[PDB]
mmCIF file of C-alpha atoms and ligand atoms in Angstrom:
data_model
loop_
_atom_site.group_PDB
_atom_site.id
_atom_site.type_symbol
_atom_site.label_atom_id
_atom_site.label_comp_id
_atom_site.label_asym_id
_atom_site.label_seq_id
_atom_site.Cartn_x
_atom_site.Cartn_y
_atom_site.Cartn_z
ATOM 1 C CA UNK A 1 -89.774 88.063 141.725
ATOM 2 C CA UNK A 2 -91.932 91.316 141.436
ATOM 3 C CA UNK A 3 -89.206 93.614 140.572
ATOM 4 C CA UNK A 4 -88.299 94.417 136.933
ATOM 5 C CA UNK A 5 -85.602 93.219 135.120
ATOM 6 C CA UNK A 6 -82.903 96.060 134.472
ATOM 7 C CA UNK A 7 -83.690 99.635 133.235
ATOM 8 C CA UNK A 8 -85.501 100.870 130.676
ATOM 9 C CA UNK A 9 -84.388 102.817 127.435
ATOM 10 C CA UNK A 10 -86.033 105.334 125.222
ATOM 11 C CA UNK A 11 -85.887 105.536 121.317
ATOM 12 C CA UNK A 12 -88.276 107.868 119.203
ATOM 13 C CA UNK A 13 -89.552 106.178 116.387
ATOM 14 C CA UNK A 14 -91.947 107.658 114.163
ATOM 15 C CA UNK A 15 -92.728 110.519 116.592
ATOM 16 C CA UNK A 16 -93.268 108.299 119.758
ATOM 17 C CA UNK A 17 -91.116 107.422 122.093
ATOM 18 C CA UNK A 18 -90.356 103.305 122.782
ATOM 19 C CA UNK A 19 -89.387 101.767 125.571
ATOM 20 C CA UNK A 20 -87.251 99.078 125.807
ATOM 21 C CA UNK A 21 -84.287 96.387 127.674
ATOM 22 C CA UNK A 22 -81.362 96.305 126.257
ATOM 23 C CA UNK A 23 -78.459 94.775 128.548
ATOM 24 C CA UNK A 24 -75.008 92.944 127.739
ATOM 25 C CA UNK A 25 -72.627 92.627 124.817
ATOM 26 C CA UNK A 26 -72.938 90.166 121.510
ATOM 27 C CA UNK A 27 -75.483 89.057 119.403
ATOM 28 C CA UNK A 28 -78.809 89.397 120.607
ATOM 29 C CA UNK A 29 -81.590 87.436 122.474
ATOM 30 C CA UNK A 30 -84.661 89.333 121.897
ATOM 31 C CA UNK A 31 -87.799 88.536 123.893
ATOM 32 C CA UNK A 32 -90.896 89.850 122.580
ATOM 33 C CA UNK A 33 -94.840 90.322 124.679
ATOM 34 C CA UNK A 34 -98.242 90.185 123.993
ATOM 35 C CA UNK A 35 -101.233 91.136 124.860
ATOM 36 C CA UNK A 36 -101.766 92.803 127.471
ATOM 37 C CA UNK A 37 -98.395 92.839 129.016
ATOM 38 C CA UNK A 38 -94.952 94.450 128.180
ATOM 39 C CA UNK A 39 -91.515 93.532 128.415
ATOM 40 C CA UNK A 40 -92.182 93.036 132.143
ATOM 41 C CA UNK A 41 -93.493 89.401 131.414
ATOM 42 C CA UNK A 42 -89.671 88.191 130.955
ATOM 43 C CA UNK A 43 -88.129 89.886 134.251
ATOM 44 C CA UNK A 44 -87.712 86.239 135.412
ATOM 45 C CA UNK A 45 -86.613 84.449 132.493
ATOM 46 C CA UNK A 46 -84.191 86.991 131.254
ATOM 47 C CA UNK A 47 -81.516 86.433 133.820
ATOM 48 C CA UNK A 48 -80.988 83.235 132.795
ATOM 49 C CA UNK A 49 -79.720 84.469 129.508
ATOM 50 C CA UNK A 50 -77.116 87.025 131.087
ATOM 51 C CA UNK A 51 -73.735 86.682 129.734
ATOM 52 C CA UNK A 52 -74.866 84.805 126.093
ATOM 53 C CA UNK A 53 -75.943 87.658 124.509
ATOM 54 C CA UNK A 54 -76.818 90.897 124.154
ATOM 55 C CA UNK A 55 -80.804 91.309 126.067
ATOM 56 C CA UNK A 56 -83.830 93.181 124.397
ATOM 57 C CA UNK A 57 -86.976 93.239 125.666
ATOM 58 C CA UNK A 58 -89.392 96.099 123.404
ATOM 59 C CA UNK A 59 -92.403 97.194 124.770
ATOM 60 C CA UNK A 60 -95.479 97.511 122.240
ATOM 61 C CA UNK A 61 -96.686 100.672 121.072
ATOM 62 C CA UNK A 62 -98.978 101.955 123.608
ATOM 63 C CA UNK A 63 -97.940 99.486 126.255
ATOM 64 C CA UNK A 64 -95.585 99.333 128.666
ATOM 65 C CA UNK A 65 -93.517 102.536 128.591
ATOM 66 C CA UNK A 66 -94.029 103.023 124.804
ATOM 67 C CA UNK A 67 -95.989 106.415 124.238
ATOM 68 C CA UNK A 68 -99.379 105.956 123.085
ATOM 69 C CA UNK A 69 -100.979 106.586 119.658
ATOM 70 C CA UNK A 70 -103.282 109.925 118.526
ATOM 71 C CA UNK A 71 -105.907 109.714 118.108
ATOM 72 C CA UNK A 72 -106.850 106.213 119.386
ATOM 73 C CA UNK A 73 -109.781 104.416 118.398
ATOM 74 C CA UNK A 74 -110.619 101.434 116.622
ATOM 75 C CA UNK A 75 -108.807 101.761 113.486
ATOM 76 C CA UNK A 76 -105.280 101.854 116.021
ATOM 77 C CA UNK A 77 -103.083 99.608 117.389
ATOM 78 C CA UNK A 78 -103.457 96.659 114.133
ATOM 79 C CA UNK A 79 -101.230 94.115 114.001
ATOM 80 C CA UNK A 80 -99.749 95.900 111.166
ATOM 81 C CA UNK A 81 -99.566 99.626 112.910
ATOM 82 C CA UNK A 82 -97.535 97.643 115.742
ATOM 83 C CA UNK A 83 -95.429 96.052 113.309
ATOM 84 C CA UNK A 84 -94.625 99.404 111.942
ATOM 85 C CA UNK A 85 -93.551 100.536 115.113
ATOM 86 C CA UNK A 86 -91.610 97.174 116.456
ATOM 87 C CA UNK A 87 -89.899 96.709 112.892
ATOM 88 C CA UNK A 88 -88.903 100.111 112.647
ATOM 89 C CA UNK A 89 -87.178 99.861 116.433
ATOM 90 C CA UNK A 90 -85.710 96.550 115.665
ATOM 91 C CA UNK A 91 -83.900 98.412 113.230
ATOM 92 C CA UNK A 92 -83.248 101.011 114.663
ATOM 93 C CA UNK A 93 -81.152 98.613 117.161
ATOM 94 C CA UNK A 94 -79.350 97.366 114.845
ATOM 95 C CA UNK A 95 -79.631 93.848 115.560
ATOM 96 C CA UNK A 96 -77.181 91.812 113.146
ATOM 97 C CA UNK A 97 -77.874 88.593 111.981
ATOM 98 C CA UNK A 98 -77.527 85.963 114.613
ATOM 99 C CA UNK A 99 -80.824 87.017 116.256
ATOM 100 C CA UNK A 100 -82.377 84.706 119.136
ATOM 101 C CA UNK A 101 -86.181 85.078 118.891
ATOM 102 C CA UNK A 102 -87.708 84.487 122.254
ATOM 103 C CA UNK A 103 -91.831 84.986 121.800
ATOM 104 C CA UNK A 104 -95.202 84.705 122.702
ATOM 105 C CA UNK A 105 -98.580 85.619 121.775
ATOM 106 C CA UNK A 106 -98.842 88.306 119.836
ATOM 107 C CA UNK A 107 -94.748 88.421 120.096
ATOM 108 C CA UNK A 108 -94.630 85.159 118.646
ATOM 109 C CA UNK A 109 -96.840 86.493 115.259
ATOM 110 C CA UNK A 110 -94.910 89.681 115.054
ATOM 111 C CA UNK A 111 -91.742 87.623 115.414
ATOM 112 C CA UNK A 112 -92.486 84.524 113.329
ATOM 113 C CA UNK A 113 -93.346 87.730 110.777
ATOM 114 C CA UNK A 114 -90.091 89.854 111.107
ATOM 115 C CA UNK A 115 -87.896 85.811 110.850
ATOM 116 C CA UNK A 116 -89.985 84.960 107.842
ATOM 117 C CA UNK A 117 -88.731 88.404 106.337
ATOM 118 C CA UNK A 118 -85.843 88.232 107.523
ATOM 119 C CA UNK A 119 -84.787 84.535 107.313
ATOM 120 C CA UNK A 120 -80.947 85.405 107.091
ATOM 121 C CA UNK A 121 -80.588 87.287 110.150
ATOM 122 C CA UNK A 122 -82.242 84.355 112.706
ATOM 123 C CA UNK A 123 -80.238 82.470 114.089
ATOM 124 C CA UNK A 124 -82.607 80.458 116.460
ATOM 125 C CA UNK A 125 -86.670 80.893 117.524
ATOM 126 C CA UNK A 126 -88.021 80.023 120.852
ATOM 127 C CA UNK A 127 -91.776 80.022 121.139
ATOM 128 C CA UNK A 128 -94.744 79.344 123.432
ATOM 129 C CA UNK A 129 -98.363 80.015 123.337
ATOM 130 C CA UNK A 130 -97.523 81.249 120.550
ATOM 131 C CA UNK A 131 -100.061 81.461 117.549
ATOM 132 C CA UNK A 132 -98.726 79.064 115.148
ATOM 133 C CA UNK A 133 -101.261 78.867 111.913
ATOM 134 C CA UNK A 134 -104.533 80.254 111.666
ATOM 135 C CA UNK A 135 -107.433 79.526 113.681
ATOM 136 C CA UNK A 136 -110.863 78.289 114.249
ATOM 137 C CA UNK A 137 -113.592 78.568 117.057
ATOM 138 C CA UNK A 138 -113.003 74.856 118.133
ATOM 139 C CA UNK A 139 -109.521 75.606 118.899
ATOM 140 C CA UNK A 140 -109.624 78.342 121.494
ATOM 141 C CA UNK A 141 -110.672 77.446 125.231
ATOM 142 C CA UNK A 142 -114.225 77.096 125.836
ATOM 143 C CA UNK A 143 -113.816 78.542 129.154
ATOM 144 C CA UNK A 144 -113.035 81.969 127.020
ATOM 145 C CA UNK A 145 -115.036 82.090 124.194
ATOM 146 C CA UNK A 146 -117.522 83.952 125.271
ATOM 147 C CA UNK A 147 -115.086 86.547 126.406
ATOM 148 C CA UNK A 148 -113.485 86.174 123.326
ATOM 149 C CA UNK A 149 -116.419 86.767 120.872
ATOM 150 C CA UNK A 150 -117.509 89.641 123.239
ATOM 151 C CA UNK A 151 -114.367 91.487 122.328
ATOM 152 C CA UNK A 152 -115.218 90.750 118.805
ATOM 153 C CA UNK A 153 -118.494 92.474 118.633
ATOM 154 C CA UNK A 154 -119.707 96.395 119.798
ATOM 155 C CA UNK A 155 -119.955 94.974 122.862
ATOM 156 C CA UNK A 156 -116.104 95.118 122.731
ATOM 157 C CA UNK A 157 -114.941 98.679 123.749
ATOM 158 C CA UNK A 158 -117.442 98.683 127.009
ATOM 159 C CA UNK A 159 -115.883 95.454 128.081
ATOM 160 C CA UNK A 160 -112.367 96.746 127.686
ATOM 161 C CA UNK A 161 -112.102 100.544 127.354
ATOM 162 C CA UNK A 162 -114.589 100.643 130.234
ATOM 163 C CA UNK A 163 -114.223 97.820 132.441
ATOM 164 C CA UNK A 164 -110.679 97.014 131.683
ATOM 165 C CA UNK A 165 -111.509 93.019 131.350
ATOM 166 C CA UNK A 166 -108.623 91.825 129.395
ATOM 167 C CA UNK A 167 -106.167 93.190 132.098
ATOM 168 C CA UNK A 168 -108.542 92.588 135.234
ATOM 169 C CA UNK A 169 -110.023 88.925 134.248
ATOM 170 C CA UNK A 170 -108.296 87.442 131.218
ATOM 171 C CA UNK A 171 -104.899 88.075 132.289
ATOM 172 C CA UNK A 172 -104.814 86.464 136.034
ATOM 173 C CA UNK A 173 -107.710 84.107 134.470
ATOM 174 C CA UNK A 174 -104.246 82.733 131.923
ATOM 175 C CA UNK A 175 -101.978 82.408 135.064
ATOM 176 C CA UNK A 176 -102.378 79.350 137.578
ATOM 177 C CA UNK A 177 -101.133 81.110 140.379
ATOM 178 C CA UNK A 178 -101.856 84.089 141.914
ATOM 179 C CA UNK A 179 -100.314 87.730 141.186
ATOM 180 C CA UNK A 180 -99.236 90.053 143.967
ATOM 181 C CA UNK A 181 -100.435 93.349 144.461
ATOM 182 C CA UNK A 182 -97.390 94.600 142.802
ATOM 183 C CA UNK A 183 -97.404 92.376 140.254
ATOM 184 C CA UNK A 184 -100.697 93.040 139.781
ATOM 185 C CA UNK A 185 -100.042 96.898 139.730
ATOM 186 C CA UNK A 186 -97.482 96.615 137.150
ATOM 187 C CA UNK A 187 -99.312 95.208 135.011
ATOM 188 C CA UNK A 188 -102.437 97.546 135.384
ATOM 189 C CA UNK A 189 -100.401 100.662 135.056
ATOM 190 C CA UNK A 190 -100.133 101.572 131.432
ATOM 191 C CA UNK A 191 -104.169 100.965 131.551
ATOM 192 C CA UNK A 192 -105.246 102.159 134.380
ATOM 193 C CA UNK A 193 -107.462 104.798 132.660
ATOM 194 C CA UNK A 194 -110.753 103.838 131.392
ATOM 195 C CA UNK A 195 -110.761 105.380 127.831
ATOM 196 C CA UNK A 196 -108.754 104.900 124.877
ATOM 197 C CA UNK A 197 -105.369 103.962 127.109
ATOM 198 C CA UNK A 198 -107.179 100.489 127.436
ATOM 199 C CA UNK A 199 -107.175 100.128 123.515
ATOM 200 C CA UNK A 200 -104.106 97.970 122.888
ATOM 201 C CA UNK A 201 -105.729 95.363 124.465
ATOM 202 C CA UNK A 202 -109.383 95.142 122.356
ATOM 203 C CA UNK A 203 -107.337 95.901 119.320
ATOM 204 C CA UNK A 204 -105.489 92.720 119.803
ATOM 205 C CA UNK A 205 -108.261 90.142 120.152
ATOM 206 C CA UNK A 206 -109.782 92.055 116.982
ATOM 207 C CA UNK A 207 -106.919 90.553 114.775
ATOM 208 C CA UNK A 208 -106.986 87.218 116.207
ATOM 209 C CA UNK A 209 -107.104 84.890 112.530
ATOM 210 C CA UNK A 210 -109.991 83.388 113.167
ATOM 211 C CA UNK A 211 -112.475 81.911 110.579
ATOM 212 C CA UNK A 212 -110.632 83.781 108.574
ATOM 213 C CA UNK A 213 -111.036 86.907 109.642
ATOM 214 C CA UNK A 214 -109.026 89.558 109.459
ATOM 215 C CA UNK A 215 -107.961 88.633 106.505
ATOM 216 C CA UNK A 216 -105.108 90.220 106.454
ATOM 217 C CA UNK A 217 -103.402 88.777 109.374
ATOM 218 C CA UNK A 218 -104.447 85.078 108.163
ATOM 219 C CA UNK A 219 -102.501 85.839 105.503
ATOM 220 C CA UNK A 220 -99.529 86.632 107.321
ATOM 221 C CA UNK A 221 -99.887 83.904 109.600
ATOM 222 C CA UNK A 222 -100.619 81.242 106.820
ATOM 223 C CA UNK A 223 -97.456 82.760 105.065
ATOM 224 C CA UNK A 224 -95.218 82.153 107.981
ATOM 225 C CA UNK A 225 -96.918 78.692 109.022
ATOM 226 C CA UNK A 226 -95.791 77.298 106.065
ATOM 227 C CA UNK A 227 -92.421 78.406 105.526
ATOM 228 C CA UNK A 228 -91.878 77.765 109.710
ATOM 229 C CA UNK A 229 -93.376 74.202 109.072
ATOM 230 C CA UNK A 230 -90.683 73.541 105.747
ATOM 231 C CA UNK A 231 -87.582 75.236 107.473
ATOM 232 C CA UNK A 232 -84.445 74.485 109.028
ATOM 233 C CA UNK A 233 -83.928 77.455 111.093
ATOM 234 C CA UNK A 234 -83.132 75.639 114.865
ATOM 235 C CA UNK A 235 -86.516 76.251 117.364
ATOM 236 C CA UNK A 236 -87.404 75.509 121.125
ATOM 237 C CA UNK A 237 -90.910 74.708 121.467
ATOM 238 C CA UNK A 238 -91.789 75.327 124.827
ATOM 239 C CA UNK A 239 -95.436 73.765 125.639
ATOM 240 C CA UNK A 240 -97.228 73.882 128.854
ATOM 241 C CA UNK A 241 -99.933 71.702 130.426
ATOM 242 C CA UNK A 242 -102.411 72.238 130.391
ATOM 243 C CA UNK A 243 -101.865 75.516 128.237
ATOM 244 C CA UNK A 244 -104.335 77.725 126.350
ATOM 245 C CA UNK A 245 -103.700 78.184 122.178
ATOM 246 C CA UNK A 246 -101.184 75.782 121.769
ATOM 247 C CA UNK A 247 -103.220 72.949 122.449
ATOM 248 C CA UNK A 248 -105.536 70.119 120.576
ATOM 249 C CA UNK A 249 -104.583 70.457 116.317
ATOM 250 C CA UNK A 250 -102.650 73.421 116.867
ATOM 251 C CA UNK A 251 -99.549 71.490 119.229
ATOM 252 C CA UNK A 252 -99.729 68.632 116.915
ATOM 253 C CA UNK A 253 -98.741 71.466 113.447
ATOM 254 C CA UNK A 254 -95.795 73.034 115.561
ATOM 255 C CA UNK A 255 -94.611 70.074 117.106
ATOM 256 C CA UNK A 256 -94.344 68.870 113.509
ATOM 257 C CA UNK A 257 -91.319 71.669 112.433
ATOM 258 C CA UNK A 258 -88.441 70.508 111.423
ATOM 259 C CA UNK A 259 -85.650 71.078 113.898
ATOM 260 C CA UNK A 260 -87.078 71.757 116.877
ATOM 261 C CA UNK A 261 -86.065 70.444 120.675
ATOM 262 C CA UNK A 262 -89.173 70.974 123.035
ATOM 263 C CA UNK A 263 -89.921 70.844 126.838
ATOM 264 C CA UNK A 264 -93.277 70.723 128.514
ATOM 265 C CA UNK A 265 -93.707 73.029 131.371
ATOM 266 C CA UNK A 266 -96.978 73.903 133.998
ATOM 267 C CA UNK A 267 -98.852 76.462 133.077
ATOM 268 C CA UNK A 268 -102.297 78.417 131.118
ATOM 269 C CA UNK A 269 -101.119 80.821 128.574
ATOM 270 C CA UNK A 270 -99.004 83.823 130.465
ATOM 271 C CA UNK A 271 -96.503 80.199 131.394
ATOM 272 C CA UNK A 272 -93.618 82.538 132.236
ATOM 273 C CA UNK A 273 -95.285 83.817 135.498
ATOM 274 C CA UNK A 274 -95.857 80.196 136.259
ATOM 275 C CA UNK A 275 -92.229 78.255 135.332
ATOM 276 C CA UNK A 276 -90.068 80.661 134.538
ATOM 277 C CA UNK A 277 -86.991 78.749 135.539
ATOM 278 C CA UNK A 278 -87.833 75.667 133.606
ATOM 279 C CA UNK A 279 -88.251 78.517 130.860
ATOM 280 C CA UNK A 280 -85.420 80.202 131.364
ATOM 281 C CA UNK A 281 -83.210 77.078 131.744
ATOM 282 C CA UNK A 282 -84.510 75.032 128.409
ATOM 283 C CA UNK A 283 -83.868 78.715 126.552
ATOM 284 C CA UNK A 284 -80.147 79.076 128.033
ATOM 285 C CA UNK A 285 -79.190 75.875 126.651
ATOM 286 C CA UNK A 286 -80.500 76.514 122.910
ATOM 287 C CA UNK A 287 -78.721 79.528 122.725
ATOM 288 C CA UNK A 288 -75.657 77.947 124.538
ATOM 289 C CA UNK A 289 -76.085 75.437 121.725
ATOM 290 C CA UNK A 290 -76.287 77.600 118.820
ATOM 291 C CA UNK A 291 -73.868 79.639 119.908
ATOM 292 C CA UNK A 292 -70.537 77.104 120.980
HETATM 293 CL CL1 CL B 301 -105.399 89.122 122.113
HETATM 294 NA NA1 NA B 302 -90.952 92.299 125.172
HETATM 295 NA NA1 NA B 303 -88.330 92.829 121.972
HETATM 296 NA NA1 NA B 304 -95.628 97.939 118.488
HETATM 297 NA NA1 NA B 305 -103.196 96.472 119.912
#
């Protein structure tokens, strides 16, 4: 269960070189990480999928296997720098338009973003922990505020570029059980060095939309909230109990879409470490589904 899923590929895009899955023939299935992982977070969900379409699993810029930016610092790694990048590869890839979304944190906002752009070409959305509208203070775990607004503050870059926390507490903190080594190891890799290789994963909390801030990205969000919350477009919702940010107000707005089959599974927020064959099973029959 350690071992990745398939081998990697390489594409340049806009000077840096992205990593990615892609495995099998048709129209794709395209599962999509946040923060802090990589495409490793589906090794044990993607199998389920093999022979129904055509597998793609991107790495983020600066994560995974994806090169890193240059000059880092805080200005990088935005949620619309990374859109830059993942758009730009998803064309690259030249998807069609019978795409299966499969996403999560930040993969769910950067994919809820490209459908909502792109509403011609989806065919289907799976989503979990996935941020669904914009947010307040109230609706994020207690247990992680603190952590949260730390990030959020100067206090920020010590807490990550230095001592790594998002990688080394949040992440095993999300996942009810416990990581091997190797596991562990995988995911520490593309961060292993304190310094600007470790900024991915501050930039990310940093455009959280929360009390409406950044802007920006509340706007985004809002925009795609409201046409996911009006549309027709077939979705899996794919809670977990307790779970993390889909949770309180938050479940109640997605499990309002129109649409949508769901399925309740064990686990915090990173749920695929925790049920991935529930996961993989409940996604193998919506795409089964849409694609008869
Ligand atoms: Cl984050
Ligand atoms: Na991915
Ligand atoms: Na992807
Ligand atoms: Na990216
Ligand atoms: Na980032």
């Amino acid at each position: 269960g350690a071992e990745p899923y398939g081998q990697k590929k390489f594409i340049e895009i806009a000077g840096k070189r992205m990593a990615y899955i892609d495995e099998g023939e048709g129209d794709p299935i395209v599962f999509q990480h946040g923060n802090p992982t990589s495409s490793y977070l589906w090794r044990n969900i993607m199998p389920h999928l093999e022979g129904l379409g055509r597998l793609i699993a991107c790495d983020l810029i600066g994560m995974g296997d994806s090169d890193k930016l240059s000059p880092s610092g805080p200005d990088r790694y935005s949620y619309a720098e990374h859109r830059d990048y993942l758009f730009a590869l998803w064309e690259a890839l030249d998807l069609g338009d019978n795409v299966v979304l499969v996403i999560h944190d930040w993969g769910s906002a950067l994919g809820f973003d490209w459908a909502n752009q792109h509403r011609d070409r989806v065919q289907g959305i799976a989503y979990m922990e996935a941020i669904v509208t914009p947010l307040e203070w109230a609706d994020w775990p207690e247990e992680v505020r603190d952590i949260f607004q730390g990030f959020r503050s100067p206090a920020g870059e010590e807490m990550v570029l230095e001592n790594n926390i998002f990688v080394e507490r949040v992440l095993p903190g999300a996942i009810l059980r416990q990581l091997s080594d190797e596991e562990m190891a995988e995911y520490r890799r593309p961060f292993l060095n304190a310094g600007e290789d470790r900024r991915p994963t501050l930039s990310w909390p940093r455009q959280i939309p929360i009390d409406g801030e950044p802007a920006d990205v509340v706007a985004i969000v809002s925009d795609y909230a409201s046409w996911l919350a009006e549309s027709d477009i077939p979705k899996l919702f794919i809670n977990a109990e307790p779970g993390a940010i889909v949770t309180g107000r938050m479940r109640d707005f997605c499990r309002s879409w129109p649409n949508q089959t769901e399925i309740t599974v064990k686990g915090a927020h990173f749920i695929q470490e925790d049920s991935p064959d529930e996961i993989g099973a409940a996604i193998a029959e919506f795409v089964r589904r849409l694609r008869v």
